[PDB]
């Protein structure tokens, strides 16, 4: 019941000038083909991912990764999965209570001295390339009563997204299958109705702010994508394929927070990224106790929440 520092493991090779592979070969140890899971003696333990300490560790690691690699100096990179293992006396525990919301007790508490395959992908509004939900879709927050506390949604159907810049110098589009997104959004709407005493749910675009949180912001092929996501939160539902307008930016308020960046224009050629909408970042509109509705807008909180979504079961403890 303590918090310590850990090291990382990597399934990467140091022969190609990647910015994740060469970073992880020296910053991390190669994966150890030695997995030992121990389903504990049917013990029930209380977890709390919102006060987890490994998320800070991973945050430092991604900060160092970006700072060391990116310079205004152009090379293709990819998010290779990162493992996080721990020395002796300091051990990690895992929860496998099927549908866990990340803050209560767990019964089939496993035990492994290292994490699972986790790729450090940064994104806003929508969590990409994540791990699906096992049985249902999960609503996670310190408690939904507080509007300041963020809300994470674990989807049990990974939705496909396809962002593409063709060979019209910085424009791009991102195609999704509208029917699947509408279906899963209706399921999340039903579950929030359940969670809010059969309350009416409304989905709306963000009230305002910078482009990073206003739009779906991520990075693919080394180029920073911002996508206008008003179509997905079209509360009226549209049944066909949805094209999402997107643009590559060369000023970026750095994701850690240091000013506005400056980068070269994107490399010539086609830029394609097919990825997995796996989670949703939401903020509930505050106030309005008397009103019979609950309005939700996407995107919010730190980038730490992206890692905490994947770290919602593991917990470091003493031996």
């Amino acid at each position, epitope marked *: 019941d303590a918090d310590t520092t850990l090291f990382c493991a990597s399934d990467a090779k140091a022969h190609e000038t990647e910015v994740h592979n060469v970073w992880a070969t020296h910053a991390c140890v190669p994966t150890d083909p030695n997995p030992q899971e121990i389903h504990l003696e049917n013990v029930t333990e209380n977890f709390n991912m919102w006060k987890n300490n490994m998320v800070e560790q991973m945050q430092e690691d991604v900060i160092s990764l970006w700072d060391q690699s990116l310079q205004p100096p152009k090379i293709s990179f990819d998010p290779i999965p990162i493992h996080y293992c721990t020395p002796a006396g300091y051990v990690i525990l895992k929860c496998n209570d099927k549908n866990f919301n990340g803050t209560g007790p767990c019964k089939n508490v496993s035990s492994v001295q290292c994490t699972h395959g986790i790729k450090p992908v940064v994104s806003t509004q929508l969590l990409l390339n994540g791990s699906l939900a096992e049985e249902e879709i999960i609503i996670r927050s310190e408690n939904l009563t507080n509007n300041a506390k963020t809300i994470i949604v674990h989807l049990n159907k990974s939705v496909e997204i396809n962002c593409t810049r063709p060979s019209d110098i910085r424009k791009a589009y991102c195609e999704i299958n509208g029917t699947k997104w509408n279906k899963v959004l209706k399921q999340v709407t039903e579950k929030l109705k359940e969670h809010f005493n059969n309350k009416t749910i409304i989905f709306q675009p963000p*009230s305002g702010g910078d482009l990073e949180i206003t739009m779906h912001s991520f990075n693919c092929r080394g180029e920073f994508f911002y996508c206008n996501t008003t179509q997905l939160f079209n509360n009226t539902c549209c049944n066909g394929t949805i094209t999402l307008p997107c643009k590559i930016k060369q000023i970026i308020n750095m994701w850690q927070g240091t000013g506005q960046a400056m980068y070269a224009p994107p490399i010539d050629g086609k830029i394609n990224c097919v990825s997995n909408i796996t989670g949703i970042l939401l903020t509930r*509109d505050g106030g309005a106790n008397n009103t019979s509705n609950e309005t939700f807008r996407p995107g919010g909180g730190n980038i730490k929440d992206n890692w905490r979504s994947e770290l919602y079961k593991y917990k470091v403890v003493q031996i």
Partner: antibody
Amino acid sequence: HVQLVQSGGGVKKIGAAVRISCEVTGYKFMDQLINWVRQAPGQGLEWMGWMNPTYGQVNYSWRFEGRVTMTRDMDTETAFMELRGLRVDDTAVYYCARGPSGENYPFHYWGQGVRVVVSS
Amino acid sequence: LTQPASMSASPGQSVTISCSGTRHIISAWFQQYPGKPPKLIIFDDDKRPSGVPSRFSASRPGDTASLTISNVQPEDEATYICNTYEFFGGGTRLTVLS
């Protein structure tokens, strides 16, 4: 010690728009969301909204959407609130606030309040 | 949520302000003076920060939080506000009988 100062109030006519500032002193401005709250004369406190000073994520109440906006300035290390199309009932004392290091509520630290009077 | 508009107390007595509604969302209490911004005096229902005397206590055993003041003195003539999250009560204008 942390402290928040506000000095952008006064008297304005109907319609129009008002800009209200709040400057922080004693903590990392990037953290700790900033709340915009209002107290009417001889009435109770009414929370308009909050704003994140990182990239500017805001969250307004249902009674001010479209009317109120919130912005920030990092080197100034200050927050701005714009209220346009004011009404006479908008006559009130206006506060910026924030809570502990543990996120937002409750509001341990308040500003000083500025009087805003909507007149003819 | 719901607070009485005003109360009345002679010096040295004990009074109790009751904020119902709540919805079990914890409780915090502010004392506010004319012109001055609200000043938090009770947080986490039954806890008080430094500088708050022993006369002030509070308890939220349900959806009806309550703030008790013992041996009222001239500091206490102010407006007392219950709050849960972003929601505040209408204020109770406690007035000592001068």
